[PDB]
Enzyme design. Structure first.
Site, mmCIF file in Angstrom:
data_model
loop_
_atom_site.group_PDB
_atom_site.id
_atom_site.type_symbol
_atom_site.label_atom_id
_atom_site.label_comp_id
_atom_site.label_asym_id
_atom_site.label_seq_id
_atom_site.Cartn_x
_atom_site.Cartn_y
_atom_site.Cartn_z
ATOM 1 N N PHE A 64 6.702 7.840 -10.903
ATOM 2 C CA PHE A 64 8.151 7.470 -10.583
ATOM 3 C C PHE A 64 8.007 6.802 -9.276
ATOM 4 O O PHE A 64 7.516 7.670 -8.402
ATOM 5 C CB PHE A 64 9.195 8.271 -10.877
ATOM 6 C CG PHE A 64 9.162 9.116 -12.401
ATOM 7 C CD1 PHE A 64 9.423 8.444 -13.658
ATOM 8 C CD2 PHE A 64 8.060 10.209 -12.145
ATOM 9 C CE1 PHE A 64 9.431 9.076 -14.696
ATOM 10 C CE2 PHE A 64 8.205 10.728 -13.534
ATOM 11 C CZ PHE A 64 8.592 10.101 -14.759
ATOM 12 N N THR A 119 2.909 11.777 -9.142
ATOM 13 C CA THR A 119 3.979 11.210 -10.219
ATOM 14 C C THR A 119 3.670 9.704 -10.497
ATOM 15 O O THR A 119 3.608 9.045 -9.423
ATOM 16 C CB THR A 119 5.151 11.964 -9.678
ATOM 17 O OG1 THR A 119 5.805 11.206 -8.699
ATOM 18 C CG2 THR A 119 5.080 13.266 -9.467
ATOM 19 N N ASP A 137 2.135 1.670 -3.803
ATOM 20 C CA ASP A 137 0.888 1.884 -4.434
ATOM 21 C C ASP A 137 0.605 3.539 -4.348
ATOM 22 O O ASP A 137 0.511 4.131 -5.339
ATOM 23 C CB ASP A 137 -0.258 1.064 -3.850
ATOM 24 C CG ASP A 137 -1.286 1.193 -4.959
ATOM 25 O OD1 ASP A 137 -2.093 2.169 -4.680
ATOM 26 O OD2 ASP A 137 -1.310 0.338 -5.690
ATOM 27 N N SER A 143 7.049 10.265 -3.142
ATOM 28 C CA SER A 143 5.889 11.340 -3.266
ATOM 29 C C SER A 143 4.910 11.250 -2.085
ATOM 30 O O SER A 143 4.591 12.445 -1.815
ATOM 31 C CB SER A 143 5.491 11.434 -4.767
ATOM 32 O OG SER A 143 4.938 10.217 -5.134
ATOM 33 N N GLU A 183 -5.977 7.036 6.302
ATOM 34 C CA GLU A 183 -6.648 5.832 6.050
ATOM 35 C C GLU A 183 -6.823 4.693 6.943
ATOM 36 O O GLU A 183 -8.168 4.043 7.111
ATOM 37 C CB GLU A 183 -6.637 5.374 4.641
ATOM 38 C CG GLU A 183 -7.855 4.487 3.989
ATOM 39 C CD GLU A 183 -7.677 2.991 4.464
ATOM 40 O OE1 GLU A 183 -6.574 2.424 4.799
ATOM 41 O OE2 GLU A 183 -8.507 2.468 4.607
ATOM 42 N N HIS A 185 -5.746 -5.909 -1.327
ATOM 43 C CA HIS A 185 -7.216 -5.723 -0.741
ATOM 44 C C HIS A 185 -7.307 -7.215 0.110
ATOM 45 O O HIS A 185 -7.770 -7.364 1.222
ATOM 46 C CB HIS A 185 -8.284 -5.201 -1.253
ATOM 47 C CG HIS A 185 -8.176 -3.879 -1.675
ATOM 48 N ND1 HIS A 185 -8.989 -3.295 -2.516
ATOM 49 C CD2 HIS A 185 -7.429 -2.741 -1.204
ATOM 50 C CE1 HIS A 185 -8.754 -1.853 -2.653
ATOM 51 N NE2 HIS A 185 -7.692 -1.661 -1.831
ATOM 52 N N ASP A 188 2.447 5.640 -3.556
ATOM 53 C CA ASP A 188 3.595 6.411 -4.336
ATOM 54 C C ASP A 188 3.428 6.520 -5.793
ATOM 55 O O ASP A 188 3.503 7.580 -6.404
ATOM 56 C CB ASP A 188 5.075 5.654 -3.996
ATOM 57 C CG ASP A 188 6.053 6.553 -4.799
ATOM 58 O OD1 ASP A 188 5.883 6.990 -5.849
ATOM 59 O OD2 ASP A 188 7.070 6.664 -3.850
ATOM 60 N N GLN A 203 0.904 -1.412 0.024
ATOM 61 C CA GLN A 203 0.061 0.006 0.006
ATOM 62 C C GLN A 203 1.046 1.244 -0.029
ATOM 63 O O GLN A 203 0.117 2.402 -0.448
ATOM 64 C CB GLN A 203 -1.147 -0.004 1.202
ATOM 65 C CG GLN A 203 -1.738 1.308 1.483
ATOM 66 C CD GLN A 203 -2.723 0.987 2.638
ATOM 67 O OE1 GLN A 203 -2.249 0.778 3.743
ATOM 68 N NE2 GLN A 203 -3.843 1.627 2.289
ATOM 69 N N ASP A 217 9.164 7.487 -6.309
ATOM 70 C CA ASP A 217 9.930 8.696 -5.753
ATOM 71 C C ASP A 217 9.684 9.405 -4.506
ATOM 72 O O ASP A 217 9.942 10.251 -4.338
ATOM 73 C CB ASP A 217 10.133 9.712 -6.916
ATOM 74 C CG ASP A 217 8.698 10.268 -7.232
ATOM 75 O OD1 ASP A 217 7.745 9.862 -6.447
ATOM 76 O OD2 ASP A 217 8.549 10.991 -8.198
#
Ligand code: HEM
Ligand SMILES: *[C@@H]1O[C@H](CO)[C@@H](O[C@@H]2O[C@H](CO)[C@@H](O[C@@H]3O[C@H](CO)[C@@H](O)[C@H](O)[C@@H]3O)[C@H](O)[C@H]2NC(C)=O)[C@H](O)[C@H]1NC(C)=O
Ligand SMILES: *[C@@H]1O[C@H](CO)[C@@H](O[C@@H]2O[C@H](CO)[C@@H](O[C@H]3O[C@H](CO)[C@@H](O)[C@H](O)[C@@H]3O)[C@H](O)[C@H]2NC(C)=O)[C@H](O)[C@H]1NC(C)=O
Ligand SMILES: *[C@@H]1O[C@H](CO)[C@@H](O[C@@H]2O[C@H](CO)[C@@H](O[C@H]3O[C@H](CO)[C@@H](O)[C@H](O)[C@@H]3O)[C@H](O)[C@H]2NC(C)=O)[C@H](O)[C@H]1NC(C)=O
Ligand SMILES: *[C@@H]1O[C@H](CO)[C@@H](O[C@@H]2O[C@H](CO)[C@@H](O)[C@H](O)[C@H]2NC(C)=O)[C@H](O)[C@H]1NC(C)=O
Ligand code: CA
Length: 595
Positions: free
Chosen positions: A186, A184, A108, A190, A258, A351, A110, A105, A188
């Protein structure tokens, strides 16, 4: 085609053309074509969108209309009949830690995120969906079939809004609806540093020249940090425990709170950033904060890549790894790094690995407290259990000692995700994640199970006998078809996840393929993949080869007993060792000298 240059991105962004750092939005990775892999753009399409009006209406919207001569089955029904199971006994993964489910997760998060639609600052259309289940514009309700226990209790449907699309956001009318990837593409980090320049700044402590990420000023976890609160009201996290008053965390990715375990690894990451940034200002005292932040953010990304590809992916794809992710050969500027639409449905395989309970072990890896083991549903947007009940240390040990739930044809998605999911906007703990994926497959225009089988060069089951052959299970293949009427109509998510697992992996033939090539492209089409000569100096890579998530824990917690191989099932204490046995990431190589 319709239009080569549509899109409402983060306008105005020109390439520094020689800066050794990725842009926060993903632009300028590919020199020849700049927006390749950048955020807030249409997900890529591997196969043509399949809509009812061929244009944007989902299959299942109008009901005289069919898909290949049959009516699609109600999302919630496919769920009730196929996905759910009652007995949680024996669904644990004898050889995968909860961390296995947890890392999935993160990656994902990212790689992709298709937001929902609002265009309503002060709506009632928001309400026409919620209270009346009136299918209309951006509302595509999930009705409950005959005899659903949820009618006696929740109403007639579960509100559901369509994902966001491209050129505008309002109604619109041309080339096949494409969905937006707000992050994004990649690998990376984020989910940590944000995808919009705007947000990426707010997360930084620009109050000092240290390249540190802004932290919580309200609460501490044994002197170690927490992310800062998202002081925006009304907050979901607050709503779940009115009395507690503890809001959601704020990170580069909005889904950060979440569930309880996800916030945890988000903290470990935020923590690692600052630790890196500090080790670097001790070494390079002359660096200004911008170089700190950036340099750190660069190591971190390298971190998430090496972990993901070296340790995670090999146990997901298994025997199918090298068939799809062959060894590195360098940057290929002709490879589309973009995340495809179907990918966002194939990676959902996860999931089905979420177990029904989260535990908190003490320092002896024993149950921590009278309420150590909790129901997974009481933890959606639950941040107060971290802040006011132990900090993240107890939960980090659960990750390493407890197992993940094993995907099973007769026990698919735990009922804590399929009967009681809490969605941030609404109030009740009664959503169904299984139905939601299925309406979303349809929302995105996904083609059926067979096109994908074909796309991947696999037999296209056309019959009950054939489907049986592919699933090695007569009963599931029969329930499947009594509902779908033909294998061409099965939704990619359920059809994909129903296949048996390839050898030594955790997903079957079709998902191995899908996942397999996406990861191949994002690795081969990223100008900043850590191994690509130029990004890191030879010496720097030699220390990066040594990272391990176990270390990540050691340096950023007070857990001191960790397994060496955190992704497989380890027992305590035989498999645990002292942090001292775990190799550290030597940053000496980052030492920079003037003259
Ligand atoms: C208890 C753990 C989890 C919870 C409660 C959860 C919950 C959710 C929810 C509510 C959505 C929104 C679906 C929609 O509106 O269409 C979602 C989407 C998604 N999930 Fe899960 N999830 C969990 C674990 C995982 C794992 C382990 C993976 C992968 C290994 C995963 C992969 C995805 C992906 C790819 C999406 C769609 C992302 C996008 O394109 O926006 N999730 N999840
Ligand atoms: C909402 O969140 C609050 C946390 O702020 C929860 O309150 C906590 O409730 C427990 C009682 O069930 C209190 O613990 C008790 O005292 C000690 C532990 O400190 C222990 O020895 C006792 O056996 C018992 O567990 C805890 O201190 C208390 N927090 C405070 C100060 O209010 C509350 O349970 C949550 N309720 C909801 C709506 O879920
Ligand atoms: C539980 O999962 C573990 C994680 O994969 C797994 O460990 C794996 O052990 C095998 C040992 O054979 C390694 O596979 C490679 O083994 C040799 C290398 O010495 C090669 O000749 C083989 O062809 C094969 O590639 C894995 O590397 C290793 N996994 C990792 C990444 O550490 C356990 O075997 C699993 N335990 C059970 C109960 O089956
Ligand atoms: C932005 O960065 C600032 C500097 O890195 C940081 O200030 C420092 O914050 C820490 C923790 O808040 C304080 O350290 C400790 O101070 C006394 C030590 O005698 C302890 O008793 C406290 O409990 C605390 O842990 C420093 O006092 C403080 N240093 C400075 C320069 O004032 C900010 O907190 C950071 N702000 C954000 C939003 O991240
Ligand atoms: C970069 O990857 C691309 C795409 O995988 C490779 O392009 C192939 O080029 C051949 C001709 O040399 C074409 O027939 C195909 O269109 C491409 N293959 C496929 C399936 O896309 C290319 O080999 C790689 N470039 C380098 C120099 O490594
Ligand atoms: Ca990304």
């Amino acid at each position: 085609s319709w239009e080569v240059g549509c899109g409402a991105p983060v306008p105005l962004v020109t390439c520094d053309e020689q800066s050794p750092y990725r842009t926060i939005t993903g632009d300028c990775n590919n020199r020849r074509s700049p927006a390749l892999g950048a955020a807030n753009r249409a997900l890529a399409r591997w196969l043509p969108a399949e809509y009812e009006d061929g244009l944007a209406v989902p299959f299942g919207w109008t009901q005289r209309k069919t898909r290949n001569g049959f009516r699609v089955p109600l999302a919630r029904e496919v769920s009730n009949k196929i996905v759910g199971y009652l007995d949680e006994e024996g669904v644990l993964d004898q050889n995968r830690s909860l961390l296995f489910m947890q890392w999935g997760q993160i990656v994902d998060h990212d790689l992709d995120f298709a937001p929902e639609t609002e265009l309503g600052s002060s709506e009632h259309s928001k309400v026409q969906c919620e209270e009346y289940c009136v299918q209309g514009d951006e509302c595509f309700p999930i009705m409950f079939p005959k005899n659903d226990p949820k009618l006696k209790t929740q109403g007639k449907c579960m509100p559901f809004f369509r994902a966001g699309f491209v050129c505008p956001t309002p109604p619109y009318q041309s080339l096949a609806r494409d969905q937006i990837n707000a992050v994004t593409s990649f690998l990376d980090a984020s989910l940590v540093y944000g995808s919009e320049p705007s947000l990426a700044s707010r997360l930084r402590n620009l109050s000092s020249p240290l390249g540190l990420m802004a932290v919580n000023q309200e609460a501490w976890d044994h002197g170690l940090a927490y992310p800062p609160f998202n002081n925006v009201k009304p907050s979901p996290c607050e709503f779940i425990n009115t009395t507690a008053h503890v809001p959601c965390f704020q990170a580069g990715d909005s889904r950060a709170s979440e569930q309880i375990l996800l916030a945890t690894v988000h903290t470990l990451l935020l923590r690692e950033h600052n630790r890196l940034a500090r080790e670097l200002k001790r070494l390079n005292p002359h660096w200004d904060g911008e170089m700190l932040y950036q340099e750190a953010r660069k190591i971190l990304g390298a971190f998430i890549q090496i972990i993901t590809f070296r340790d995670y992916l090999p146990i997901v794809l298994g025997s199918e790894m090298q068939k799809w992710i062959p060894p590195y050969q360098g940057y290929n500027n002709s490879v589309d790094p973009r995340i495809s639409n179907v990918f966002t449905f194939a990676f959902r395989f996860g999931h089905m690995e979420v177990p029904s309970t989260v535990s908190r072990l003490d320092e002896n890896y024993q149950p921590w407290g009278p309420e150590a083991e909790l129901p997974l549903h009481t933890l959606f947007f639950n941040t107060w259990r971290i802040i006011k009940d132990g900090g993240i240390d107890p939960l980090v040990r659960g990750l390493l000692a407890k197992n993940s739930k094993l995907m099973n044809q007769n026990k698919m998605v735990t009922s804590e995700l399929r009967n009681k999911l809490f969605q941030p906007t609404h109030k009740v703990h009664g959503f169904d994640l299984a139905a939601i994926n299925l309406q979303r497959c349809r929302d995105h225009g996904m083609p059926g199970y067979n096109s994908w089988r074909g796309f991947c060069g696999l037999s296209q089951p056309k019959t009950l006998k054939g489907l049986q052959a592919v699933l090695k299970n007569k009963v599931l293949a029969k329930k499947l078809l009594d509902l779908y009427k033909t294998p061409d109509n099965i939704d990619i998510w359920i059809g994909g996840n129903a296949e048996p697992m390839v050898e030594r992996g955790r997903v079957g033939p079709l998902l191995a393929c899908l996942l397999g090539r996406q990861f191949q492209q994002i690795r081969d089409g990223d100008r900043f993949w850590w191994e690509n000569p130029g990004v890191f100096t030879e010496k720097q890579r030699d220390s990066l080869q040594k990272v391990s998530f176990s270390r990540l824990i050691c340096d950023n917690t007070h857990i001191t007993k960790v397994p060496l191989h955190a992704f497989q099932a380890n027992n305590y204490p035989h498999d645990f060792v002292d942090c001292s046995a775990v190799d550290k990431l030597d940053l000496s190589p980052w030492a920079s000298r003037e003259n």
